[PDB]
Symmetry: C3
Subunit: 33 residues, 3 copies
Amino acid sequence: EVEALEKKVEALEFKVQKLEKKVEALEHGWDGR
Amino acid sequence: EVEALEKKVEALEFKVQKLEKKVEALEHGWDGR
Amino acid sequence: EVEALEKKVEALEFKVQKLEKKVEALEHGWDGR
């Protein structure tokens, strides 16, 4: 259980990091985005 | 503890999925979004 | 393990909440955003 939860949390941390990058790009008009 | 953490993680996976969909809609101009 | 996972999940819940707010601001044109 714990091990699979660590796995899920680590996938979520990646997803959230990618979201943060894309949201910042949208807010700042980065590179015409 | 584990059970409530599984609950929290599963709510987060949904939230993150909805965010991903909304962010893609914003990036692609999907449906005038 | 559990304690550090609770920590990670709680940081993620904050990050996701901030993302949700920023994504809503982008969708609604809130305050010229």
